[PDB]
Amino acid sequence: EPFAKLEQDFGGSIGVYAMDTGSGATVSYRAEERFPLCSSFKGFLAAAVLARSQQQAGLLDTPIRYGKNALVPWSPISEKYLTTGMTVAELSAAAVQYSDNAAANLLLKELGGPAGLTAFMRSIGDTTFRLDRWELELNSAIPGDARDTSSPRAVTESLQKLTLGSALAAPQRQQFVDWLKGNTTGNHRIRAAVPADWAVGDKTGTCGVYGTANDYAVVWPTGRAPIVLAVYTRAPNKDDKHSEAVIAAAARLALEGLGV
Numbered sequence: 001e002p003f004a005k006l007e008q009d010f011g012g013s014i015g016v017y018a019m020d021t022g023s024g025a026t027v028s029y030r031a032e033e034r035f036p037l038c039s040s041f042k043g044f045l046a047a048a049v050l051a052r053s054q055q056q057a058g059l060l061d062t063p064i065r066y067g068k069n070a071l072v073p074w075s076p077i078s079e080k081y082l083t084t085g086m087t088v089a090e091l092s093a094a095a096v097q098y099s100d101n102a103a104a105n106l107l108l109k110e111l112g113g114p115a116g117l118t119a120f121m122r123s124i125g126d127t128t129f130r131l132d133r134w135e136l137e138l139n140s141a142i143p144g145d146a147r148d149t150s151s152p153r154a155v156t157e158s159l160q161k162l163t164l165g166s167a168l169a170a171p172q173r174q175q176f177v178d179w180l181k182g183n184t185t186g187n188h189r190i191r192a193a194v195p196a197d198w199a200v201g202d203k204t205g206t207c208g209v210y211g212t213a214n215d216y217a218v219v220w221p222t223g224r225a226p227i228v229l230a231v232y233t234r235a236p237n238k239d240d241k242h243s244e245a246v247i248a249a250a251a252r253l254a255l256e257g258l259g260v
C-alpha cells in the first residue's frame, strides 16, 4: 500500500526491486515493468568497458582523443579536456560519476554502439536490458517504447552480478564498486535514505520528460550482508516532472521492507 500511495501522490508509476543478498529477502513493486534507463545505462557501460579490460591490457590507460564534435550537452568533465584528451578509465569515471554524455558516447563507440553494450548484458544473463540509441536521443522516454529500457528487477540482478558476484574479475569488480562509490549525482536519491555510516555506490538517470528518473545502488550495511536495489519512475504526461524526493522515499520504503 505505501508504494501505491507514493506513486499516486507523485502522479505516475514507481518501480522498485531490492534484495538482501544475505537472506534473499526481497522488496518488489512493479519490478517487471520497463522504465527508461536514461543516464543510468552508464553504470553498465563502465562495467562493460571493465570486462573488456580483462582481455586488452592497458585498455583502461589507453588515451582517447576527441574534438569539439564529440562534445554533447552536459559533458562537464570531458569538455575541460577537449584540447587535451582523456583515458578510457577517466572517461568511464566521468560517465559514472558525473553522468558525462560525451564520455558515454565515446565509450559506446569503443564497444560497438548500443547493440554492443546490450550484447555485454546478454553475456551476464540479462535478457531484459536493451540500449538502442546514443546520447542524447536515448532519453526520449516515450510511453510504451521499449527502446533504451530495462526493469527494476533486471537492473538489480545485473548490478548484483557485477558488483558482488563473478561477472567481473575481482580487480575490475572493485574498480566498478569504487566508481559507483564516488558518484556525485545521487545525494538526493537512494543515498538520502541510506544510513550515514553505511557504504554506498549508485548511478542515477534523469530523462528530463515524462516524470522519468531513477537510481540504483549497492549498499554495504555494517554487520549484515549488502543490499542491492533499483528505483525507477515515469509518468504519463510529457510535461510531468520527475521528483528526487519520491526516489528517496521509495528507497526508504524498500529499506524498511528489508528491516532497515
Ligand SMILES: O=C(N[C@@H]1C[C@H](c2nnn[nH]2)c2ccccc21)c1cccc(F)c1
Pocket (backbone or CB within 6 Å): 039, 073, 074, 098, 099, 185, 204, 205, 206, 208
Ligand atoms: O545538466 C543537465 N542534466 C544533467 C544530466 C546528469 C544526470 N541527471 N541524472 N543522472 N545524471 C546530471 C547530473 C547532475 C546535474 C545535471 C545533470 C541538463 C539540464 C537541462 C537540460 C539538459 F539537456 C541537461
